[PDB]
């Protein structure tokens, strides 16, 4: 790998610089290099890895949606034939997106998840595995689409099981996992009732635990609770 010659600490330092410069592709490459050093990641380092790839894949997803919409309209009745270019370019972006997802999933499988024993790390990585299978599911149309969806579900479910046993209901990782798994139900698994039930129960159980928190922890938890509420408002 091209980062093999750079010190782990230097990769982390440059990932932080790349974040400040809004250079998220660089940030992700630096964090991939850091993961490949083989040591476990601290909480802050896991956050850097997450932020970097979230921004990269988020831009790819937004572009894929623009192109998919154009392609959809080109196939409606009365549209002029414009050739293969829209499909080709949507496929190009899609293949790059799948490459990023495969890279993240590869880092999780080799070997972040298997070395993650504390709930804070293990739930975080399993949530990420669910997220990146979900992004693969957003673009999938083939023989393995059901298996891709089930891979996302299975990762989210293992993360959910650990988080309920090992984390308080206000833990931001537990909350963000529930938020995203709820979106999985709504947008991927055709299960809006499960999505709504999960969001509501998560919100209510967090509400009941806020009294235990410091002011700073309260701020962190209520931020994600508001996202759950936002989705509930969108869906009801």
């Amino acid at each position: 790998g091209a980062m093999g010659s750079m010190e782990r600490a230097s990769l982390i330092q440059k990932a932080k610089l790349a974040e400040q410069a809004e250079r998220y592709e660089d940030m992700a490459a630096f964090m991939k290099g850091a993961v490949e050093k083989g040591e476990e990641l601290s909480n802050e380092e896991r956050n850097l890895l997450c932020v970097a790839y979230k921004n990269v894949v988020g831009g790819q997803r937004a572009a894929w949606r623009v192109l998919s919409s154009i392609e959809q309209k080109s196939n409606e009745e009365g549209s002029e034939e414009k050739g293969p270019e829209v499909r080709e370019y949507r496929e190009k972006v899609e293949t790059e997106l799948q490459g990023v997802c495969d890279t993240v999933l590869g880092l999780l499988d080799s070997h972040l998840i298997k070395e993650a024993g504390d709930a804070e790390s293990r739930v975080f990585y399993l949530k990420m595995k669910g997220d990146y299978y979900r992004y693969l599911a957003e673009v999938a149309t083939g023989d393995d689409k059901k298996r891709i969806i089930d891979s996302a579900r299975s990762a989210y479910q293992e993360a959910m099981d650990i988080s309920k046993k090992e984390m308080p209901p206000t833990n931001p990782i537990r909350l963000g996992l529930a938020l995203n798994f709820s979106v999985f139900h709504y947008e991927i698994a055709n299960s809006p009732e499960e999505a709504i039930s999960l969001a509501k129960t998560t919100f209510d159980e967090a509400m009941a635990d806020l009294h235990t928190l410091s002011e700073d922890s309260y701020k962190d938890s209520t931020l994600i609770m508001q996202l759950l509420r936002d989705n509930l408002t969108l869906w009801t």
Partner: peptide
């Protein structure tokens, strides 16, 4: 789109 983190 709905919110995710």
């Amino acid at each position: 789109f709905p919110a995710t983190v």
